[PDB]
Amino acid sequence: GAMAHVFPVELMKGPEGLGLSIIGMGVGADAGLEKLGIFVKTITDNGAAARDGRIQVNDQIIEVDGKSLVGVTQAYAASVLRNTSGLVKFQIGR
Amino acid sequence: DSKDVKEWYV
Ligand SMILES: [Cl-]
Ligand SMILES: [Zn+2]
């Protein structure tokens, strides 16, 4: 459709993490490390995100546990994601 | 360049 698809995903973190990898997309003209959006590059077989089944490669992780992942460094985003624990709440874009 | 940056695992 012509409109963005944004949806919530809640899942339980696994012992080996969320089970996905992230990349940034988009920068400012200053060329510093801030990324405009954060996107899923890979999903780990048998990991929490794979088992849940909803999140896909090239989905955007817009927000996690109330923390925006818009206009943030890749390191910041990954750190937020790594600090999740137990139930994790996402806003996902497609 | 951004195009060769490594993905971060979480
Ligand atoms: Cl994002
Ligand atoms: Zn590069």
Numbering used by the authors:
A (entry chain A): 1254 to 1347
B (entry chain B): 1831 to 1840
Sentences from the paper on this structure:
eliminated after deleting the last five amino acids of the Nrx-1 C terminus.
together, we show that loss of Spn affects the synaptic structure of the NMJ. excessive seeding of new AZ scaffolds at the NMJ. sets the threshold for AZ assembly.
